[PDB]
Each structure stands twice: as structure tokens, then as C-alpha cells.
Design a protein around this ligand. Structure first.
Ligand SMILES: Nc1ncnc2c1ncn2[C@@H]1O[C@H](CSCC[C@H](N)C(=O)O)[C@@H](O)[C@H]1O
Ligand SMILES: [Zn+2]
Ligand SMILES: [Zn+2]
Ligand SMILES: [Zn+2]
Ligand SMILES: [Zn+2]
Length: 1139
């Protein structure tokens, strides 16, 4: 038996019938009482001892949607004076069967701790107070629901951009009052109330409206929507940051607005899609569409062939009047060079010209007249070194219509193709350019299309043997062809039509006999060597979902024995340079294989008497393979001394599979820049830079206290400013010497290098800019950061960001950043790097913007040192449908093996879920090479931050029950009733519906967790909570790739999905459970995943430490970049050491 009106099952032991007061009169009568009377027509009244019930007398909830489902609900209790705050049944009239509830509503989501619950009837609006003793339970749950909703709304008003793991933490950590009979809230509760909470939050945006972003569209909100299948649109309840910029930086962002700035996939089936109309108002917009759009704005598009070279390209001839030479010829060559030519008016060498092309792609071609001459066919010729227009560079629209750029484009042309003489000025930097922080065609930098490098022009020089032919574009190409040229330097004595040599060259590297060489895994070979059963589906109902590229080998190493080659007609054929090498085994290449690749050094080799022949083309680079037993310093000291340094102590007998000693033929300052790390964090970026020996941080700016604190502990000589960089900048700009706290503010000339990670939050999307999006970026921390650069003018600049920075806002964010630096007159470039390729067991791509002052050199992006899964390695950038790449050649292979989770944390003592002891002994030695380095050669007794979050009894239980086999997640959980330690009991998942797309289990059992599996609309109450297999995961599984690896354990041979900031198992941060322990990863494990030395200190609570680390730039990546700035400095030091 179950009610025809409300639906309640009569056998329900928690059912209750309506119990009435005496003086209870019908609604119109009780509303005519004199005990009764904001800008509306009601009348509004208070209401106490209330009870809500169906037409038959069953006490009913109001949240459940029965009002919506047309079910007439009647209420009863004491009504009071609008002003009467007493919830004691005393100053009012009792009403009975009070009008069917037209609708119910809420008010109290701002500067108001109280949340009011009102009902609307055919006659009056009532404000509820206390329920009746019989209704109390029913109102109880409803109340709890309302509270989570409040916490969720309030938090989001204060923190939009909040991620799912934060929401969870906000909820988790909020202490509810006594008035709410819940000890504390959990992810389980939020997920359980996920529909009420979301539908409440939607309503807050519909109600309190601004031109601002709907709170239901925040990352955490959409995350909760996708995780717990939620129906959007079921709504009901109603009732000027400015960047501290310099004139120059302001001007750029101010003009882009006053130029390039101009201004429907509705769902149909939703409750918002079924409601008219607006000019009654200005909003009726679909929430399901709103999400799809909000989600698509988050994703980019990463193949595409090389961009076409400019000016190749058709130009059209002009004049037939009088072109005659002027003066005596400069020189002779079949060609006769001149200095002046008169095409009606005077035209000298080194003047600029305009060339009218074919009326199609219509920009006017611009060129520097390099040379003037007459060819053997008496035709008047010229050499046109082309200029690139601002719009034709990466910059595009962002550039000055008058700014031109020098390119590696030149061609010979007849004097007919010339249109006119054009005034082209070189906007050279001032004598004092560093102090400068706050018409016709001009130029400033040299642009390399292939690598988006804006650089300071050479200058020069024109020798008297080429003062007539002087083409920089021709010189560059010549130098390039020379380096790319395989050439013999010294030869011994020739043999059977092949010359034996002692030294060869290519790419700028000189290869001698005995020097070691890198080659692809295909280059040679070593002496090689040579079905699932039935799962219990009753126990593992979700395993069916389980169903349904990897890193290459590092370079093959060889030592040079012979440089024999080939011969062409008379002399040596460079196309035929061959090498005879002694093959070097890596421990992995031995019979040992993967066990060799464990505790061994990343750079240890095994000598072999084996030999191979390979072309000098196949050679990737040169390295240093030395015998350690004949060594000057320790193996560590030699290894840590410089690049491409390997060693061998024994020799591998490939045949006997044994280790003999090797044969006897196998035997033998840096100016640290004064740095300012803006958005310093705990100092991971500064760390890699200090590791590089190229810097010293003297001023670090951190807004968040726990981070700045952690910085100081690692950098004691740094003036850590715990402010908003915007106030800090305004003070120097105001002329201050010191801040409130009496700390010396950095002054112009004090900062040699600027570096930082400006967080992009108010505009971090992909779609076209807009009035909203632009205003947010106009004042962004990117613009505050570029102002710092403009004011201070450091020798070197770095802006590290999220890889998508490069793609953000139809790549406009990157185009404007590059524009800024060019306006100032800085050499600059962008580029993407995968941290994993730099010695970290994590897959994280970062956008890196390098900038360098005119005078210094522009650094290159570091060559990858570690072999990584190709998928994780897409570094290319498509800007305005042109593919931009970095100088990185190693695409592809690398010199060292991959760093794995195993190498990252295999040595750490066992810790249980909820570990709290900050300082503990290691209780053992380091095992991996990686461990040895972060633990250090110097003995450390204490292990720090091996602290791990305390997960709930339920989550804790779930983790115990996640198998240890690689790549194991939720889908492996058993459907078993776990005793949650405490009174609470995690029960089985009830499988009551049919999955029409997944079928039946092997046992003929159902797979459906909710009515929507059938194709119908989700029936609530079919929702389950506190289940071992989270109910929400089968609920949405199908539409979200079976919830990938949520509750997944890290693979020992795997990596970290990303930079983990708050480890949650159903989180957007990847696999977070430890490979073997029934817990989530500890702070130190994360710190290790970042390649931080075990000495590295962290401040605040567990979560602050977690944030500090997952915010950091991994020191290995920072050092890699720092090392590129290293060469850039030494090179510029020897260059500024002449006569
Ligand atoms: N307006 C502002 N002014 C100064 N610092 C800010 C800021 N807003 C955010 N921050 C800081 O921005 C930092 C970004 S994380 C930076 C990573 C870092 N360079 C490293 O390798 O550790 C955070 O640590 C945050 O607290
Ligand atoms: Zn009923
Ligand atoms: Zn809709
Ligand atoms: Zn040329
Ligand atoms: Zn459903």
C-alpha cells in the first residue's frame, strides 16, 4: 500500500499522520484575526509549530518536488505577527488545512547568516519558524540541505574559479551548528544533496543578477554536475580591480580595446527552455547549453604542416622611363656592382624600397636595397633583402601598422620591380635604455618565423671585400649551411678507396677519435632474447567497465674507433662519413634488463668489445664516456660537473653474461643575476635557477602568507615581500625607499632578472575575447607583471604559465604579451616544455615566455634530457593557423631513461591514512638514483612532510579495497558491506534498473543504478549514499568514459597525472592513491614528484603544503631553463671581452 496523493508506502515505519490543534480555523478565517496586519501585496506573516501534509494526512516533505508534480500540499500550525520573533506558540492563531502550497521559497544568501523559508498560498505569504514535534524530522533533512546550499553559495560568491577539491575542502571543514544534527559534512553528503545544492545555486544567479558570471558555472560546480548526474533547470527560490601599470603597458592594452573590440544551441527539453519571456525581462538562457559552452571554452586544439615562407610570392614590374647608373662601379665579379642608380630620382645602396605585388593578398612588399649591379646580359639588377610587416609576425593585429621586422628573406630582382623609395628608421635603444621605464615606417628586431624569436639585429659588419654585396639574410644562411655541413677536419692516411680520419664536424660539434657518440635505438643491436579467466560479477558488479603511446629507448652509446667514410671522384665524399664504434651497454640492455634500471645510476654504462658501423648522419650529438677507476674527482662530482657525462666501471661479456674489468684501450666565474621572483610561492622556480648557479633571489613577492613563509626557510638572504605585487609596484612608482614593515624595496638597476608565474583566472578561456573577458585580462596579473618588466628593465625575463596560456583567448593573451615586450624593445620568444622530459615522474606541460634585453642574447629552450611518452610531448603551438615550434630537436629520443613513481618514492617509510607526524626517520637508505640525488650525498636524519591527509571512514574503507595490480581504480571495488569502524555501515549498491546500453551481468544481474539507465528521467530516492562503490560513478559512468581511474593507484612504472595540489580520489587531479598503501599521496611524495630535494622546507597546514608544492615550478625544469640562460651569459661575457 502507498498514497494516491503523495505516494508514501503505508508499511514505511517512518510515516506520520496529521495531528491538529483545537482553535485551528481554516486559512481565510485565521487571516482575518487582529493579531495580524516588504514592498509587496500579501500579507506577510510568521508561522510556527508547522506541519506539511498531503490531501489524506501524510506528513510530506516539500523539497521532493510534489508541489511541482501538481500534488496539493496543505499546512497547519500557529501563525504570528510579521514582527513576532518568538517561536513559542503564544501570540498567534492556529490554522488548519491552510491553502494548497502555490510554491515555497528561500531568502538568505549574502550578508545574512539567517536563511528564511517561506510558503506562498492562494491568500498569503508565510515565513516559517519552528516545526511541530511530529514534523521536526522531515524539516530536519530539508534544513540540512539548505545549509550545504548556503555554504556552497556563500563560498562561491567569495571564490569563483574554485576547483572541485576546494569545494570538497570548504564543505568538509565547515563546522555546522547544533541546530543541524550532522557532526560535519562530507563529499558523500554534497553528492547525496547534489541536485538540491545545484538547483539552489542556479536560482541564486537567476535571482541576484549582475552582468557577472553565474556561480553555477564555476569549475567545482560543473565538476559536481558531471560527477553526480544532476538535472539542470529545476530552479525556485528568489527573495573594480586595476593593474598597477606604467604609461607604456597601459597604452598597449588601452589601444587594443579602442581598436579590435566588437560583439544559440538551446537544449529545448529543459524547465528553463520551457518558459517565456524577455524584451518581460532580459534572461531566459538555458543552463545545459551554458555548461557545454563553459566546458568547451576550457579545451584547446593540439598534426599541422610547416608555415609558408613570406614573399614567395609574386611581385609585378612597373616603369619604362629612364633607369641609368650613377658614378664609377664599386667592384666587379659576370656581374658589375654600382653604388647609385637613377630611376628619374636618386637611389643609393642601403636605401629602402617598396614593391607593388599582384592584386590578391595585398600588403605592399618592403625591402632593403642590399646591392646594385649589371649582369652579363646587360640587365640592371638589385638585391632586395625583405622586411616583415608587424601583422605578418606572430603578433598580428597587436602590432604597430608602421613597425617592420628584419627577416631571412632576400632575392635578386630587376630594377623594374621597384615602386618607390621609402623612409625606414632603426628605433635603436637609448644609451640608458634600462632607466627608460615610465609618421613613417620603423624597425627594431630580427624575426625568425620557424621559432617565433624576436631578436636584436646582428650589427654587422661590412668588410671591404663585401661592402657592396652586404646582405645579412645571405650571411645568416651561409653560417647556417656551414654548421649543418658534415666536414672532415684532419685525415690520417687513406685505404681501399676510403680515407681514415682523426677529426670530423657538424652542427657546431667537433668529433675526434675516442670521443663518444649518441645514436637512435635503431642504429645498432645487442645480443637479444625471447589468457584472462572468469571474474565473480556479484562481488565485482562494476569490473565489466574495465574494458570497455609509451616512452622510447634512450640514445644508443658508442665510442669512436674509426672514421673511414667514402670518396667522390678526386676528394672525400662528405655524404659518406661512416663510423666504427665500440657498443656501450646500459644496465637495462644487459640480461638484468628492468632490474638494471632500478638502483643503478641514471648515467652508468658497461663497456663492450662489441662493434658497429654507422653513418655520421645518424649521430645525434657527442657525450663523455669515461672510466671511473681513473678519475680526478668522485663519480658524483664528475657526473654533476657538466652535460652529457656518463661512466663505466666494468665490462659486459655479452657471451658469458659476466663482468670482467675493462680492456686497457678503453682507458684514458658565472655571474649570478640579482633576481626578483614575482608570485614566488614556496620558491620552486627560484630553486632551479639557484641550482643553475646563474642567479640569487634578493626580492620575492608572495601575497599568500604560508608560501612566502616557506620561501624564507629555503632562501634566508631574500627580502620576501608578503604583499600584492600591485601595491609593491605602486610604492616604487611613488618613489618609496622602504615598505610599512621596513624592508628595502627593489629599485631600477637593482633587478638583473625578472621571473614569475602570474595566475591567469578571470579570462583563462579559449573563445574570442569580449567586453567582459578583455576587462579581466586588461587588469590581469599578466599586465601587472609586464609593468614590472617595463619599469625595472631586467637583462632577463621569464613568465611561466599553464600550457594553455599559449592558446588562451584565440591566442590573444600571448600575442599581446609578445607585443608589450617588442614595444619596450626587448628580444623575446615563447615555447612549451614537458617537465617529465627534464627528470620528473609527472606529466606537466608549461607555457614559457623568454625575454632578454637588447645587448644580452635570447636564450634557447633546453634540450629534453629524459625519454617520455610521445602523447605527453606535444610542444607545437598553432597561432592564427600557423604552427610555431622551439629550437628543441630531441623530439623523440633523449640521453637518459624515464624517471618513474618507483624512482620518485620507492624509499619512503610506510605511513597510514591520516599521517600527522611532520618529522620522522627514513628507517632506510635511498634506493633509486633519483632518490640518492634529492636525499643528497650529505646525510639527513629527519624525513620531512611525509604527512598524508586524513580521509573519511568511508573513503578510507574504499582505498583498503582498491587492489594493488597496476592501473586499478573504483571499477575493482567489491560490492560488500564494510563496517565503517564507527557505528556507521557502508552498505551494498542495490542494482534495480536495466542498463539498456551495458546489458546484463554474467550472473544475469541488472547493471542499472538509476531510472535514467533505462532512458527515463532520473528518479530521486533511487540515489544511494555511503556505498563502497560510489553510486555516482555508475550513475554517470557511460557519459564520462567509465570514470577513467577515479580511486586509482599510481603505477610504480607510471607518472603523476599532473601537479597535485589537493589529493582527492574523485578529483580532477588524476590518480592520487599510493601504489601499495591504503592512502592518498603524502606532501613529500608530491614534493618528490616535483623533484624537490628532501631538505626543501614547507610551511602551514597539510593542505597549504600540498598547494605550495603543486603550485611550484619543478626545480629540474627551472634548472634546465636556467642552464640555457647560463650559456647566454658566458657567451655574452667572452663577447664583451675584446680590445
Ligand atoms: N596578486 C598577487 N600578488 C603577489 N602574489 C600573488 C598574487 N596572487 C597570487 N599570488 C601568488 O601566486 C603564486 C602562483 S604559484 C608560483 C609558482 C612559483 N614561481 C614556484 O616555482 O613555486 C601563488 O603562490 C600565490 O599565492
Ligand atoms: Zn499521502
Ligand atoms: Zn535548456
Ligand atoms: Zn641576401
Ligand atoms: Zn539517473
Amino acid at each position: 500500500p502507498k498514497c494516491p496523493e503523495c505516494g508514501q508506502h503505508l508499511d514505511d515505519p517512518n510515516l506520520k499522520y496529521q495531528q491538529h490543534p483545537e482553535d485551528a480555523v481554516d486559512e481565510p478565517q485565521m487571516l482575518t484575526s487582529e493579531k495580524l496586519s516588504t514592498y509587496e501585496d500579501s500579507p506577510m506573516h510568521r508561522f510556527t509549530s508547522f506541519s506539511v501534509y498531503c490531501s489524506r494526512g501524510h506528513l510530506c516533505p516539500v523539497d521532493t518536488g510534489l508541489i511541482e508534480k501538481n500534488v496539493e500540499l496543505y499546512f497547519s500550525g500557529c501563525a504570528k505577527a510579521i514582527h513576532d520573533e518568538n517561536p513559542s506558540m503564544e501570540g498567534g492563531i492556529n490554522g488548519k488545512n491552510l491553502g494548497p502550497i502555490n510554491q515555497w521559497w528561500l531568502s538568505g544568501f549574502d550578508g545574512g547568516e539567517k536563511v528564511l523559508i517561506g510558503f506562498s498560498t492562494a491568500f498569503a505569504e508565510y515565513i516559517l519558524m519552528e516545526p511541530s514535534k511530529e514534523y521536526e524530522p522531515i524539516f530536519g533533512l530539508m534544513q540540512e540541505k539548505i545549509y550545504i546550499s548556503k555554504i556552497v553559495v556563500e563560498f562561491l560568491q567569495n571564490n569563483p574559479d574554485a576547483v572541485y577539491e576546494d569545494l570538497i575542502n570548504k564543505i568538509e571543514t565547515t563546522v555546522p551548528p547544533s541546530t543541524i544534527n550532522v557532526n560535519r559534512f562530507t563529499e558523500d553528503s554534497l553528492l547525496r544533496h547534489a541536485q538540491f545544492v545545484v538547483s539552489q545555486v542556479e536560482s541564486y544567479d537567476e535571482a541576484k543578477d549582475d552582468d557577472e558570471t553565474p556561480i553555477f558555472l564555476s569549475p567545482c560546480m560543473r565538476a559536481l554536475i558531471h560527477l553526480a548526474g544532476v538535472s539542470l533547470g529545476q530552479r525556485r527560490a528568489t527573495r573594480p580591480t586595476k593593474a598597477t601599470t606604467t604609461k607604456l603597458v597601459y597604452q598597449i592594452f588601452d589601444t587594443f580595446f579602442s581598436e579590435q573590440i566588437e560583439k544559440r544551441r538551446r537544449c529545448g527539453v529543459c524547465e528553463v527552455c520551457q518558459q517565456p519571456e524577455c524584451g518581460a525581462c532580459l534572461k531566459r538562457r538555458c543552463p545545459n547549453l551554458a555548461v557545454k559552452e563553459a566546458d568547451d571554452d576550457e579545451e584547446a586544439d593540439d598534426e599541422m604542416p610547416s608555415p609558408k615562407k613570406l614573399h614567395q610570392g609574386k611581385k609585378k614590374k612597373q616603369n619604362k622611363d629612364r633607369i641609368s647608373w650613377l658614378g664609377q662601379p664599386m667592384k666587379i665579379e659576370r656581374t658589375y656592382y654600382q653604388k647609385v642608380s637613377i630611376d628619374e630620382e636618386m637611389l643609393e645602396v642601403g636605401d629602402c624600397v617598396s614593391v607593388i605585388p599582384d592584386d590578391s593578398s595585398k600588403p605592399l612588399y618592403l625591402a632593403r636595397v642590399t646591392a646594385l649591379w649589371e649582369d652579363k646580359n646587360g640587365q640592371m639588377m638589385f638585391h632586395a633583402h625583405w622586411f616583415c610587416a608587424g601583422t605578418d609576425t606572430v603578433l598580428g593585429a597587436t602590432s604597430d601598422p608602421l613597425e617592420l621586422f628584419l627577416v631571412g628573406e632576400c632575392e635578386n630582382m630587376q630594377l623594374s620591380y621597384i615602386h618607390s623609395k621609402v623612409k625606414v628608421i632603426y628605433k635603436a635603444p637609448s644609451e640608458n635604455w634600462a632607466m627608460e621605464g615610465g609618421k613613417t615606417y620603423f624597425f627594431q628586431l630580427w624575426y625568425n618565423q620557424e621559432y617565433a624569436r624576436f631578436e636584436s639585429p646582428p650589427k654587422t659588419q661590412p668588410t671591404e671585400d663585401n661592402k657592396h654585396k652586404f646582405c645579412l639574410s645571405c650571411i645568416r644562411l651561409a653560417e647556417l649551411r656551414q654548421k649543418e655541413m658534415p666536414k672532415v677536419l684532419e685525415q690520417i692516411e687513406e685505404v681501399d678507396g676510403r680515407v681514415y680520419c682523426s677529426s670530423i664536424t657538424k652542427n657546431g660539434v667537433v668529433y675526434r677519435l675516442g670521443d663518444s657518440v649518441y645514436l637512435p635505438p635503431e642504429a645498432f643491436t645487442f645480443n637479444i632474447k625471447v589468457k584472462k579467466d572468469p571474474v565473480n560479477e556479484t562481488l565485482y558488479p562494476e569490473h565489466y567497465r574495465k574494458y570497455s603511446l609509451d616512452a622510447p629507448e634512450p640514445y644508443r652509446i658508442g665510442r669512436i674507433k674509426e672514421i673511414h667514410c667514402g670518396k667522390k671522384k678526386g676528394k672525400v665524399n662528405e655524404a659518406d662519413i661512416k663510423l666504427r664504434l665500440y657498443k656501450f651497454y646500459r644496465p637495462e640492455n644487459t640480461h638484468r634488463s628492468y632490474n638494471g634500471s632500478y638502483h643503478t645510476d641514471i648515467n652508468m654504462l658497461y663497456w663492450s668489445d662489441e662493434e658497429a658501423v654507422v653513418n655520421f648522419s645518424d649521430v645525434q650529438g657527442r657525450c663523455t664516456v669515461e672510466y671511473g677507476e681513473d678519475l680526478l674527482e668522485s663519480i658524483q662530482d664528475y657526473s654533476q660537473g657538466g652535460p652529457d657525462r656518463f661512466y663505466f666501471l666494468e665490462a659486459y661479456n655479452s657471451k658469458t653474461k659476466n663482468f670482467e674489468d675493462p680492456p686497457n684501450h678503453a682507458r684514458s666565474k658565472l655571474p649570478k643575476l640579482r633576481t626578483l621572483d614575482v608570485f614566488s610561492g614556496c620558491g620552486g622556480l627560484s630553486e632551479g635557477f639557484h641550482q643553475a648557479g646563474i642567479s640569487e633571489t634578493l626580492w620575492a613577492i608572495e601575497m599568500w602568507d604560508p608560501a612566502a613563509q616557506a620561501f624564507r626557510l629555503n632562501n634566508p638572504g631574500t627580502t620576501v615581500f608578503t604583499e600584492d605585487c600591485n601595491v609593491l609596484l605602486k610604492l616604487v612608482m611613488a618613489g618609496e625607499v622602504t615598505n610599512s614593515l621596513g624592508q628595502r624595496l627593489p629599485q631600477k638597476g637593482d633587478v638583473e632578472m625578472l621571473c614569475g608565474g602570474p595566475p591567469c583566472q578571470g579570462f583563462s578561456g579559449m573563445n574570442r575575447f569580449n567586453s567582459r573577458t578583455y576587462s579581466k585580462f586588461k587588469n590581469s596579473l599578466v599586465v601587472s607583471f609586464l609593468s614590472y618588466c617595463d619599469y625595472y628593465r631586467p637583462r632577463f625575463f621569464l613568465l611561466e604559465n599553464v600550457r594553455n596560456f599559449v592558446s588562451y583567448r584565440r591566442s590573444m593573451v600571448l600575442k599581446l604579451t609578445l607585443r608589450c615586450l617588442v614595444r619596450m624593445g626587448y628580444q623575446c620568444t615563447f615555447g612549451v616544455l614537458q617537465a617529465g622530459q627534464y627528470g620528473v615522474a609527472q606529466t606537466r606541460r608549461r607555457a614559457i615566455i623568454l625575454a632578454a634585453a637588447p645587448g644580452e642574447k635570447l636564450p634557447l629552450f633546453p634540450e629534453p634530457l629524459h625519454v617520455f611518452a610521445p602523447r605527453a610531448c606535444q610542444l607545437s603551438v598553432v597561432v592564427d593557423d600557423k604552427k610555431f615550434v622551439s629550437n628543441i630537436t630531441r623530439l623523440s629520443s633523449g640521453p637518459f631513461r624515464t624517471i618513474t613513481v618507483r624512482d620518485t618514492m620507492s624509499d619512503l617509510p610506510e605511513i597510514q591514512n591520516g599521517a600527522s607526524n611532520s618529522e620522522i626517520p627514513y628507517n632506510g637508505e635511498p634506493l633509486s638514483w633519483f632518490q640518492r640525488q634529492l636525499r643528497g650525498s650529505h646525510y639527513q636524519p629527519i624525513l620531512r612532510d611525509h604527512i598524508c591527509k586524513d580521509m573519511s571512514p568511508l573513503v578510507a574503507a574504499r582505498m583498503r579495497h582498491i587492489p594493488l595490480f597496476p592501473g586499478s581504480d573504483w571499477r575493482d571495488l567489491p560490492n560488500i558491506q564494510v563496517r565503517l569502524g564507527d557505528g556507521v555501515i557502508a552498505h551494498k549498491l542495490q542494482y534495480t534498473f536495466h542498463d539498456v546500453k551495458n546489458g546484463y551481468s554474467s550472473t544475469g544481474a541488472l547493471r542499472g543504478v538509476c531510472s535514467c539507465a533505462e532512458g527515463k528521467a532520473c528518479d530521486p530516492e533511487s540515489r544511494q549514499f555511503s556505498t563502497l562503490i560510489p553510486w555516482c560513478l555508475p550513475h554517470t559512468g557511460n557519459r564520462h568514459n567509465h570514470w577513467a581511474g577515479l580511486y586509482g593507484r599510481l603505477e610504480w612504472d607510471g607518472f603523476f597525472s599532473t601537479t597535485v595540489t589537493n589529493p582527492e580520489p574523485m578529483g580532477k587531479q588524476g590518480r592520487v592513491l599510493h601504489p601499495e598503501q591504503h592512502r592518498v599521496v603524502s606532501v613529500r611524495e608530491c614534493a618528490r614528484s616535483q623533484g624537490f630535494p628532501d631538505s626543501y622546507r614547507f610551511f602551514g597546514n597539510i593542505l597549504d603544503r600540498h598547494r605550495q608544492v603543486g603550485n611550484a615550478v619543478p626545480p629540474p625544469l627551472a634548472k634546465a631553463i636556467g642552464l640555457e640562460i647560463k650559456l647566454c651569459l658566458l657567451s655574452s661575457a667572452r663577447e664583451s671581452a675584446s680590445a
